[PDB]
Ligand binder design. Structure first.
Ligand SMILES: CCCCCCCCO[C@@H]1O[C@H](CO)[C@@H](O)[C@H](O)[C@H]1O
Lengths: 149, 48
């Protein structure tokens, strides 16, 4: 799945591993860590969510008290919009006939959170569903591919 | 000696024209498909 990202969005930022590079994790500095927190962990981009036996007011009240940091310039109320990530039809094959099984992953460019189409898509993905050795379903499963599989 | 003579050269022309066009049009479709292998890049990444 990382490799899938690494070449599907290749060249862009999306195409990076979350855990980051080996060199980076070897050199990051108190400094660099700081900035990340400072530059990114900002209230207009954070969300306090909770569920349970809590009163809405009670909750917010606490927020008002610790999530202080009130801003001056308009900059701080602005959500930096991100550079587009270019999809690119392609493949990356990592071979090692020494492994027991092989994993393959195919994909097309998705629509993006907002789109009302994601619904249809998920309806589809359900039709094919998923399967796995232990599934008691067996040859009677409804997913054509599961059945053939 | 060769009554066809005329119709023979007329076709010749026609042949040269299709043949020019068709050969080129295919030089594309041969490359197009092959591109994948020509652009391809590989690397040897042994383990640690
Ligand atoms: C040199 C003697 C030429 C005699 C033929 C005169 C007509 C040439 O013309 C050709 O004749 C063919 C007939 O088989 C047709 O099928 C072609 O469409 C026509 O262009």
């Amino acid at each position: 799945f990382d490799y899938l990202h690494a070449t599907a969005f290749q060249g862009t930022a999306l195409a990076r591993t979350v855990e980051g590079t080996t060199e980076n994790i070897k050199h990051l500095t108190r400094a660099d860590l700081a900035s990340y927190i400072d530059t990114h962990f900002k209230a207009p981009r954070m969300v306090l969510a909770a569920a349970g036996g809590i009163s809405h007011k009670e909750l917010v009240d606490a927020a008002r008290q610790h999530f202080s940091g009130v801003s001056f310039t308009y900059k701080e109320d602005a959500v930096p919009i991100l550079p587009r990530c270019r999809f690119t039809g392609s493949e990356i094959r990592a071979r090692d006939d020494a492994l027991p099984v092989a994993h393959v992953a195919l994909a097309v460019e998705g629509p993006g959170w907002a789109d009302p189409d994601n619904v249809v898509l998920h309806v589809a993905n359900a039709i094919i569903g998923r399967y796995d050795r232990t599934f008691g379903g067996g040859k009677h499963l409804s997913s054509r591919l599961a059945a053939l599989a | 000696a060769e009554p066809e003579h005329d119709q023979r050269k007329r076709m010749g022309l026609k042949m040269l024209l299709i043949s020019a066009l068709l050969t080129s049009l295919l030089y594309y479709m041969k490359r197009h498909k092959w591109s994948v292998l020509k652009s391809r890049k590989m690397a040897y990444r042994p383990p640690k």
